[model samples]
Target: KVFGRCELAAAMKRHGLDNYRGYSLGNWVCAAKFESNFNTQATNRNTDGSTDYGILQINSRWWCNDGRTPGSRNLCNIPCSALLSSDITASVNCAKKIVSDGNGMNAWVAWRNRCKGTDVQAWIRGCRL
Candidate 1:
């Protein structure tokens, strides 16, 4: 599912990430943009031979398992393909748990490499939230 920035901002806000644990809606949206551009089916193989899954680009090594990959902590206790659903409920729930784990947005390299310290307001420029 490809989400418009405003729509994505609203969905994320409703998921309690508007300001959950010091991270803002902008922070989440920006991370999504860099990670998967709101496409739920997105996945990328990492240089370390692990894969990133879903809109958040969750790592196969820790968060979830893709089956083909071995040694996953499977912290989310879910299959990687589940994250690919356009529904996003599972993705958002997993993401919330991730933040609660104390990593905050720091869990995502995309957040650090791109969203951090930037003018993130543009991520919701016309959302009227």
Candidate 2:
């Protein structure tokens, strides 16, 4: 499923992304926009042979098990397929674990390159959340 901008914002906020680990909801929204354009089924294969899955594009190498990424730790302890569903609950949960594990939103390159040090508030403008 692909989500509208505000719709994704509201859903992410409800899942506790607002101010999560000191990262604003806009940060999350911004990352999702660049990472996968809010499409739950988005996937990208990395040069290192890992695949990124879901809206946030959680990587198979470190976060989830896709049975193809070499040395996958599966830190999220869920199948990579879980991240590719319209239901973002598992994706959000894994993202929280990533942050809690000291990575913060910087775990995603899209966040670091785009959302970081930028005025991310514009990503959520006019959203009644």
Candidate 3:
């Protein structure tokens, strides 16, 4: 959705997420790549009957309200639709809180399943961050 990796890096940097929550920019970039490929509107329905929202694929069970879907704690206090925008401000803020709670980026299952222990530096290799 973004023009390229450089644009994504710039947006993350501008949001003060260059190194937020002790995770590397590489981790963030890699996570975004794996989770949504930089598409903010990306979403997926989980096998557990829960839904993941936005680029980071945040869980609706603990983060946002999906209207007809119940059991939302709304931890991020945001609407699920808001996380689906290209602006990424709300999504980034919510992701910061998710990391701070515990396990850092491991809060995202995608991070554990795809990004952990991998060569993440290439996430920003061609991008001018």
Candidate 4:
């Protein structure tokens, strides 16, 4: 499925993490809410000038698949790091890797915590691309 905010939130429920804070979930929720209204089947033009794929917002052609880094249309089936981004579920799974090291959902926690003790807007001031 083309996992977006609604899908991810549902997935979160399936995976047993439904307690995620409203704010943290809010950003993504709003992103999908306004962007596609939780439409897992939604497709949009990407910044890199390529088409994405399935639920979870998989960036189809541009994401790596098999031998192609940023393969063509409908081409997936490669490694996760290849070009599966835009896929909401895969992206979150990837995010889980970065901060949690594949352990916990603490990645956004850092961002939230960063926003906590200081200017909330300034929290992501040094945010990476």
Query: Top lDDT: which candidate number?
Result: 2
lDDT of 4 by residue, 3-73 (tens): 43445555544443333433343343333344444555555555665544333344544332433435354
Candidate 4: stretches off by over 4 Å: 1-10, 13-23, 54-91, 94-129
Q: What does candidate 3's lDDT look like per residue over 2-58, in tens digits?
A: 536778877887888877877777788778888888788888998777788777888
User: Which has the better lDDT: candidate 3, or candidate 4?
Assistant: 3
Each candidate's lDDT (Cα)?
A: 0.86, 0.95, 0.82, 0.40
**Clash totals, every prediction:** 0, 0, 0, 20
List the candidates' TM-scores in order. 0.92, 0.97, 0.92, 0.36
> For candidate 3, what is the lDDT?
0.82
List clashing residue pairs in candidate 3: none
lDDT of 4: 0.40
Q: List the residue pairs that clash in candidate 1.
A: none
Q: Tell how far residue 13 is off in model 1, in angstroms.
A: 1.3
Off by more than 4 A, model 2: none
Ranking, lDDT, top scorer first: 2, 1, 3, 4
Q: Pairs clashing in candidate 2?
A: none
Candidate 1 vs candidate 2, TM-score winner: 2
Between prediction 2 and prediction 4, which has the larger TM-score?
2
lDDT (tens digit, per residue) of candidate 2 on 80-128: 9999999999999999999888768888999999999999999999999
